[PDB]
Amino acid sequence: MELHKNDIELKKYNIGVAISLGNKWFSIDNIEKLVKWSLLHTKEYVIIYIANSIKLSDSHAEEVAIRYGRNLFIKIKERVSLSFSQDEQAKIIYATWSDIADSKYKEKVKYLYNLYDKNINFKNYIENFVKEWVSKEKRTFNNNEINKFGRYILEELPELMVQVKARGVLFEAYVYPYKTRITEFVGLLQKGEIFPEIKTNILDNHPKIFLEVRE
């Protein structure tokens, strides 16, 4: 279980553990290993949160939080309190969607929504983007559902691109077990190599750092 470097071994960064809820890799055991690894490499804090989700709220990430995220967090809490010491546990912050989506975060998301409605190339790209992920599955989805799922990605896009506070705590890096199409996409966005207006409008020369950590 290691980082697939200098700054990390020097513990320059606080580390986020980004949980894709419903992704079969994110068993409690693999989540435990990620939190273990992050505790041993972090500058101070480890921030556990729900990163993606692939009507009781106007926000999909919020609806995910109250339907599934709370129960996941309760299971993580109980496991952590048996696997780690009192002092290690004090390094861990459980960031709900609300802890992350403060007013500054919501302005970025709003910018992306407006761009999704006005720029048809961006709409086409994010949409076709969803169509690939569902292409690897058995179920079908209509274009209206495809479009709904696209908006859900934009809600999570700022957290992947910019360094943001959770409960007042800034985490510069996050761990994830594998590269995904979203991480390559975010890579191009952060460089201004795709949809450069997004970099111009919502990024701030402090890019979120992506740390690939697996067995």
Author numbering: 1 to 4, 11 to 60, 70 to 230
The authors write:
Cyclodipeptide synthases (CDPSs) use aminoacylated tRNA (aa-tRNA) substrates to form peptide bonds between two amino acids yielding a cyclic dipeptide product (CDP). 20_3 (GenBank: EFK64745.1) produces cyclo(His-Phe)8 whilst ParcuCDPS from Parcubacteria bacterium RAAC4_OD1_1 (GenBank: ETB63777.1) can synthesise both cyclo(His-Glu) and cyclo(His-Pro)9. ParcuCDPS belongs to the XYP sub-group of the CDPS family, characterised by the presence of 3 residues: X40 where X is a non-conserved residue, Y202, and P203 (numbering respective to AlbC). ParcuCDPS displays a Rossman-fold common throughout the CDPS family.
Additionally, we hypothesised D58 was acting as a potential active site residue, within hydrogen bond distance from the catalytic serine (S26), which could be important for S26 to act as a nucleophile. In the common CDPS fold helix α3 and α4 exist as a single continuous helix whereas, in ParcuCDPS a flexible glycine residue (G84) provides a significant bend and change of direction, splitting the helix into two. This structural change of β3 facilitates the placement of D58 into H-bonding distance of the active site S26. The active site mutants – S26A; S26C; D58A; D58N; Y167A; Y167F; E171A; and E171Q—were also generated to confirm the loss of activity upon removing catalytic residues. Indeed, when the hydrogen bond between S26 and D58 is disrupted by mutating D58 to either an alanine or an asparagine, ParcuCDPS loses over 90% of activity, while preserving its structure. Further investigation into the changes imposed by these mutants was performed by solving the crystal structures of a select few mutants containing changes to the active site or the pocket residues. The mutant structures were able to be solved using WT as a model and retained an equivalent fold to ParcuCDPS (Supplementary Notes 4 and 7 relating to Supplementary Figs. 13 and 14). Therefore, the disruption of activity is caused exclusively by the change in these few residues which appear important for the enzyme to produce a CDP.
